[PDB]
Protein backbone atom coordinates (compact mmCIF):
# COMPACT_ATOMS: atom_id res chain seq x y z
CA UNK A 1 0.00 0.00 0.00
CA UNK A 2 2.79 2.44 1.06
CA UNK A 3 5.41 1.49 -1.70
CA UNK A 4 2.53 2.71 -4.02
CA UNK A 5 1.61 5.87 -2.03
CA UNK A 6 5.18 7.29 -1.23
CA UNK A 7 5.48 9.19 -4.60
CA UNK A 8 2.91 11.40 -2.90
CA UNK A 9 5.12 12.15 0.17
CA UNK A 10 8.14 13.35 -1.92
CA UNK A 11 5.61 16.06 -3.28
CA UNK A 12 3.00 16.47 -0.40
CA UNK A 13 4.39 17.05 3.16
CA UNK A 14 1.33 17.50 5.53
CA UNK A 15 0.66 13.81 4.66
CA UNK A 16 4.34 12.87 5.57
CA UNK A 17 3.81 14.62 9.04
CA UNK A 18 0.63 12.44 9.24
CA UNK A 19 2.77 9.26 8.34
CA UNK A 20 5.90 9.26 10.66
CA UNK A 21 3.35 10.42 13.39
CA UNK A 22 1.27 7.16 12.72
CA UNK A 23 4.31 4.78 12.42
CA UNK A 24 5.72 6.31 15.75
CA UNK A 25 2.26 5.92 17.57
CA UNK A 26 2.13 2.31 16.26
CA UNK A 27 5.77 1.61 17.63
CA UNK A 28 4.33 1.97 21.18
CA UNK A 29 1.42 -0.45 20.51
CA UNK A 30 -0.26 -3.57 22.06
CA UNK A 31 -0.76 -5.37 18.69
CA UNK A 32 2.54 -7.02 17.54
CA UNK A 33 1.83 -6.19 13.82
CA UNK A 34 1.84 -2.40 14.70
CA UNK A 35 5.58 -2.48 15.84
CA UNK A 36 6.41 -4.17 12.47
CA UNK A 37 4.15 -1.70 10.52
CA UNK A 38 6.28 1.05 12.15
CA UNK A 39 9.61 -0.70 11.10
CA UNK A 40 8.31 -1.21 7.52
CA UNK A 41 7.12 2.44 7.03
CA UNK A 42 10.33 3.68 8.66
CA UNK A 43 12.67 1.17 6.78
CA UNK A 44 10.98 2.40 3.48
CA UNK A 45 11.07 6.15 4.41
CA UNK A 46 14.88 5.48 5.04
CA UNK A 47 15.20 3.43 1.70
CA UNK A 48 13.53 5.57 -1.09
CA UNK A 49 13.42 8.99 0.83
CA UNK A 50 16.75 9.92 -0.59
CA UNK A 51 20.01 8.48 -2.20
CA UNK A 52 22.32 11.36 -0.75
CA UNK A 53 13.27 19.10 -1.40
CA UNK A 54 16.69 19.93 0.23
CA UNK A 55 19.17 17.01 0.95
CA UNK A 56 19.85 18.49 4.49
CA UNK A 57 16.06 18.11 5.41
CA UNK A 58 16.40 14.32 4.44
CA UNK A 59 19.94 13.29 5.75
CA UNK A 60 18.72 14.74 9.20
CA UNK A 61 15.13 13.27 8.93
CA UNK A 62 16.62 9.72 8.23
CA UNK A 63 18.98 10.15 11.29
CA UNK A 64 15.83 11.38 13.32
CA UNK A 65 13.69 8.27 12.56
CA UNK A 66 16.88 5.99 12.78
CA UNK A 67 17.34 7.24 16.41
CA UNK A 68 13.59 6.23 17.01
CA UNK A 69 14.66 2.78 15.47
CA UNK A 70 17.37 2.33 18.25
CA UNK A 71 14.21 1.91 20.43
CA UNK A 72 13.16 -0.77 17.83
CA UNK A 73 16.76 -2.24 17.94
CA UNK A 74 15.87 -2.55 21.69
CA UNK A 75 12.29 -3.90 20.94
CA UNK A 76 11.44 -7.70 20.77
CA UNK A 77 13.15 -10.33 18.41
CA UNK A 78 10.92 -10.30 15.27
CA UNK A 79 10.82 -6.45 15.10
CA UNK A 80 14.66 -6.40 15.38
CA UNK A 81 14.97 -9.13 12.69
CA UNK A 82 13.05 -6.91 10.19
CA UNK A 83 15.63 -4.12 10.78
CA UNK A 84 18.69 -6.48 10.15
CA UNK A 85 16.98 -7.51 6.84
CA UNK A 86 15.48 -4.10 5.60
CA UNK A 87 18.61 -2.01 6.41
CA UNK A 88 20.55 -3.82 3.57
CA UNK A 89 18.07 -2.31 1.02
CA UNK A 90 18.14 1.09 2.91
CA UNK A 91 21.99 0.93 2.30
CA UNK A 92 21.54 0.06 -1.44
CA UNK A 93 18.98 2.91 -2.11
CA UNK A 94 20.60 5.43 0.45
CA UNK A 95 24.48 4.91 0.37
CA UNK A 96 25.68 7.93 2.51
CA UNK A 97 23.84 6.77 5.77
CA UNK A 98 26.30 3.72 5.73
CA UNK A 99 28.63 5.38 8.36
CA UNK A 100 25.73 6.16 10.85
CA UNK A 101 23.90 2.85 10.34
CA UNK A 102 27.26 0.96 10.91
CA UNK A 103 27.59 2.49 14.41
CA UNK A 104 23.77 1.87 15.03
CA UNK A 105 24.54 -1.91 14.46
CA UNK A 106 28.10 -2.22 15.75
CA UNK A 107 26.97 -0.98 19.24
CA UNK A 108 24.25 -3.76 19.14
CA UNK A 109 27.08 -6.31 18.27
CA UNK A 110 29.30 -5.28 21.22
CA UNK A 111 26.46 -5.91 23.81
CA UNK A 112 27.22 -9.63 22.96
CA UNK A 113 30.85 -9.48 21.57
CA UNK A 114 33.68 -9.83 24.21
CA UNK A 115 36.75 -8.41 22.31
CA UNK A 116 39.59 -10.17 24.32
CA UNK A 117 41.84 -12.84 22.77
CA UNK A 118 42.00 -15.92 25.16
CA UNK A 119 38.32 -15.76 26.18
CA UNK A 120 37.14 -19.00 24.48
CA UNK A 121 33.36 -18.29 23.91
CA UNK A 122 34.04 -15.04 21.94
CA UNK A 123 30.28 -14.18 21.96
CA UNK A 124 27.68 -13.81 24.79
CA UNK A 125 24.87 -16.23 23.71
CA UNK A 126 23.14 -16.33 27.13
CA UNK A 127 22.31 -12.47 26.97
CA UNK A 128 20.39 -13.03 23.64
CA UNK A 129 18.01 -15.18 25.90
CA UNK A 130 15.21 -13.57 28.05
CA UNK A 131 13.84 -16.03 30.71
CA UNK A 132 10.80 -14.69 32.72
CA UNK A 133 7.95 -16.85 34.29
CA UNK A 134 9.27 -19.97 32.28
CA UNK A 135 8.68 -18.15 28.92
CA UNK A 136 12.30 -18.41 27.46
CA UNK A 137 12.50 -16.30 24.24
CA UNK A 138 15.45 -15.52 21.95
CA UNK A 139 15.34 -11.71 21.29
CA UNK A 140 18.20 -10.09 19.27
CA UNK A 141 18.85 -13.06 16.93
CA UNK A 142 22.68 -12.96 16.58
CA UNK B 1 47.76 -5.37 38.50
CA UNK B 2 44.44 -6.09 36.63
CA UNK B 3 43.83 -2.30 35.95
CA UNK B 4 47.59 -1.91 35.00
CA UNK B 5 47.53 -4.77 32.37
CA UNK B 6 44.07 -3.59 31.06
CA UNK B 7 45.33 0.04 30.53
CA UNK B 8 48.99 -1.14 29.65
CA UNK B 9 50.35 1.14 32.47
CA UNK B 10 53.75 0.26 34.08
CA UNK B 11 53.64 2.81 37.03
CA UNK B 12 50.82 0.88 38.86
CA UNK B 13 52.69 -2.43 38.07
CA UNK B 14 55.89 -0.99 39.78
CA UNK B 15 53.72 0.06 42.82
CA UNK B 16 52.11 -3.45 43.09
CA UNK B 17 55.50 -5.35 42.60
CA UNK B 18 57.43 -3.30 45.24
CA UNK B 19 54.35 -3.52 47.62
CA UNK B 20 54.49 -7.43 47.55
CA UNK B 21 58.36 -7.20 47.92
CA UNK B 22 57.92 -5.15 51.19
CA UNK B 23 55.06 -7.59 52.23
CA UNK B 24 57.68 -10.44 51.95
CA UNK B 25 60.33 -8.79 54.30
CA UNK B 26 59.32 -16.02 49.81
CA UNK B 27 55.96 -14.02 49.58
CA UNK B 28 57.45 -12.46 46.35
CA UNK B 29 57.83 -16.02 44.89
CA UNK B 30 54.27 -16.97 46.14
CA UNK B 31 52.73 -13.90 44.39
CA UNK B 32 54.96 -14.58 41.24
CA UNK B 33 53.71 -18.25 40.89
CA UNK B 34 50.16 -16.86 41.59
CA UNK B 35 50.85 -14.50 38.60
CA UNK B 36 52.04 -17.58 36.52
CA UNK B 37 48.51 -19.09 37.17
CA UNK B 38 45.98 -17.17 34.92
CA UNK B 39 47.72 -13.68 35.18
CA UNK B 40 51.28 -14.01 33.59
CA UNK B 41 50.12 -16.40 30.78
CA UNK B 42 47.89 -13.52 29.49
CA UNK B 43 48.42 -10.24 31.49
CA UNK B 44 46.35 -8.32 28.82
CA UNK B 45 44.18 -9.35 25.78
CA UNK B 46 47.29 -8.64 23.62
CA UNK B 47 50.51 -10.67 24.48
CA UNK B 48 52.51 -7.31 24.39
CA UNK B 49 51.63 -7.18 28.18
CA UNK B 50 54.43 -9.86 28.57
CA UNK B 51 56.74 -7.51 26.47
CA UNK B 52 55.82 -4.54 28.86
CA UNK B 53 56.35 -6.89 31.91
From TrEMBL, chain A:
Entry superkingdom:
Eukaryota
**Mind telling me what this protein is named?**
Fanconi anemia, complementation group I
**What organism does the record attribute this protein to?**
Homo sapiens
List the top taxonomic levels of the source.
Answer: Eukaryota, Metazoa, Chordata, Craniata, Vertebrata
